């Protein structure tokens, strides 16, 4: 159950 | 369930 | 099932 | 239960 | 339960 | 319950 | 409960 | 409660 | 109660 | 109460 | 109470 | 009370 | 009270 | 009081 | 109050 | 108070 | 006060 | 005061 | 006589 | 004989 | 033989 | 005769 | 019969 | 008859 | 029959 | 029968 | 029936 | 019958 | 039966 | 009806 | 009933 | 009945 | 009711 | 009722 | 009583 | 009522 | 996070 | 051979 | 989320 | 065989 | 953090 | 077999 | 860090 | 079997 | 570093 | 059986 | 330094 | 039991 | 180096 | 019982 | 090397 | 009892 | 090599 | 009692 | 910043 | 399956 | 800098 | 399953 | 540089 | 499950 | 350098 | 549970 | 180069 | 418990 | 080289 | 407790 | 070579 | 407690 | 080869 | 507390 | 094959 | 003290 937040 | 979030 | 969202 | 945070 | 946090 | 901090 | 932090 | 400290 | 250090 | 120093 | 101190 | 000397 | 000191 | 002493 | 000299 | 010579 | 030599 | 002496 | 099945 | 499924 | 079910 | 399971 | 069952 | 358990 | 449950 | 426990 | 407890 | 109980 | 605790 | 108890 | 401490 | 106390 | 002191 | 005392 | 006092 | 004392 | 598995 | 799996 | 698989 | 597991 | 599980 | 587990 | 445990 | 435990 | 401990 | 122990 | 430990 | 213990 | 120490 | 000890 | 000791 | 004790 | 010692 | 010893 | 996700 | 996000 | 997750 | 973040 | 985390 | 971090 | 942890 | 670490 | 450490 | 360390 | 440490 | 080391 | 070494 | 040691 | 020696 | 040590 | 002591 | 030895 993956989550990624790039910002950038 | 990968869940991907891009900001830039 | 992936899920991807771009801003930018 | 992965959790990326990419800043930069 | 991991967390990563990159900050560059 | 790991915690990844990079810095470069 | 681990904890890394890697400057580099 | 393992305590990694990385630099370089 | 680990602690590693790092330098190199 | 481990302390690891590492210098290289 | 162990100590390393590791050069190399 | 241990104490580790590496030089190598 | 121990103390080692390697070097190789 | 132990002292060790490697050379090798 | 040993002491120890291992060269080898 | 013993001493330890080891050559090998 | 002993002492040991070992070559070998 | 004993005096060890192996030789091999 | 390997089987891999990936889901994302 | 090796064999792939991947979903994503 | 050998089987891999990864799920992320 | 393994059984590979990754959730993350 | 060998199983895994990696969480992370 | 091994089985593993991972988390983290 | 062996049983694991590593935590990191 | 064993049974290990990791922390860490 | 064995069990081990490794914090670390 | 045995019980480890490790600490570090 | 048999009780360890080792602290290092 | 052992009971170890070590300390490094 | 033994009891071990070995500090060291 | 008996009680050791190591050290070193 | 035996007792030991072993320093070394 | 003995009492053991080693030095070495 | 016994004691014994051995340096060695 | 004995004494022991060793010397080596 | 529900899982069912079956195989053969 | 066969195969079922279930998620959610 | 369901799977069905047949090989051979 | 048969498996089933549930988290949270 | 709760865990379920059932084999065979 | 059965299983359980919780954390925190 | 509070545990919770039942096998069989 | 049944099993607890608590840190801190 | 307070241990709590239940078994059986 | 029942266990406790405190550190520091 | 200091140490508490209870069982039974 | 009970015990107790210090160090320094 | 002081010691201290209680039983029962 | 009571124990008491030092050294240097 | 100065020595101390109480027993009772 | 007591005892005292002084080398060198 | 002077020694001293006193009892009681 | 009183004890006194030279050597050499 | 607001996000809501359902799937099912 | 139920999701919630909240930046900013 | 602020976050806010929910899962379930 | 709740989860919170701050940074800066 | 400032950090907070909350779980649960 | 709280924690902090500082930095710097 | 500066550093600060807090945890529970 | 509280922590601090100095460098340099 | 210096160091310095606390805990509690 | 508070620590300290110098080097070079 | 130089090398100094102190504890408590 | 305090310690020195003095090397080359 | 040379060596040093102070305790106390 | 003072030390020396010379070599070569 | 050469060896000095000096203790107190 | 003298010594001194010649080989070859 | 040469050999020399000296003491005091 | 004086000490002298040959050998071959």
Avoid: N
């Amino acid at each position: 159950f993956k989550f990624e937040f790039k910002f950038e």
